[PDB]
């Protein structure tokens with residue numbers, strides 16, 4: 001390890017203290033936790049995520065999250081989270097376990113963090129190091145275009161990569177994002193994404209689709225499909241890599257079969 005990082009060993013749990021919280025909307029939040037010292041950084045390679053874990057209702061619960069902060073930040077880590085409230089959706093009366101646990105924490109409370117984890121690492125300037133599985137060394141490749149399909153909270157792994165590319169004036173990679181959600185209200189981090197589109201149009205293409213469309217809507221409506229893939233993601237080729245993160249059903253039934261029909265091979269698609 002070159003820098004003074006927090007995630008020194010992936011097999012260790014680090015209890016971090018909650019020091020700030022922001023109400024983004026009725027069901028969205030930003031939670032900020034302190035690192036071991038004001039001079040520490042998290043130590044999370046681009047492409048990887050951390051896990052939070054705690055005991056809830058007498059059972060151990062573990063869930064993955066990709067922070068919105070970066071290794072440029074000293075002393076804290078920021079998470080943006082959608083809270084799934086109980087007795088709000090007829091199909092899920094109990095709501096979400098970890099997201100409700102976070103919403104119920106008091107400033108000063110701690111929660112376990114672990115990482116970095118994930119089979120893909122972006123090394124910059126279009127280079128991606130990917131492991132076939134946890135027991136293999138990574139194979140490196142270079143691409144010119146990165147396609148991205150996110151559904152709901154799956155936007156954070158994409159935003160982390162987008163920002164790493166754009167922060168580097170000399171990175172020529174172009175990112176194409178197709179962001180899908182249940183309704184316009186559920187579009188997480190829209191202001192942040194549109195600020196990036198206005199400042200870096202040449203290296204970032206943005207498009208949305210929603211299941212429930214508002215009367216005034218300029219984008220697509222419906223599940224991710226063949227037409228959307230052809231019109232808003234780069235064409236198949238060795239110079240293209242497609243990244244995906246979203247609900248299992250969306251990835252399995254809406255993404256994979258249409259990517260196949262369009263010509264994107266599985267050796268050139270990765271799911272976070």
Ligand SMILES: Cc1cc2nc3c(=O)[nH]c(=O)nc-3n(C[C@H](O)[C@H](O)[C@H](O)COP(=O)(O)OP(=O)(O)OC[C@H]3O[C@@H](n4cnc5c(N)ncnc54)[C@H](O)[C@@H]3O)c2cc1C
Pocket residue numbers: 049063064065066067079080081082084085086088089092094095096097098099100153154156157245272
């Ligand atoms: C690499 C990666 C990065 C991620 N990063 C983030 C992130 O930055 N921020 C983030 O918020 N999440 C993120 N997620 C996803 C998130 O890990 C988990 O699904 C999440 O917080 C769900 O936890 P839960 O324990 O709260 O819900 P659980 O208890 O797991 O699940 C309930 C399930 O039922 C449904 N459900 C329950 N209640 C409701 C309700 N009221 N309305 C609608 N549907 C409902 C949902 O489909 C949900 O997944 C990431 C996932 C991956 C794989």
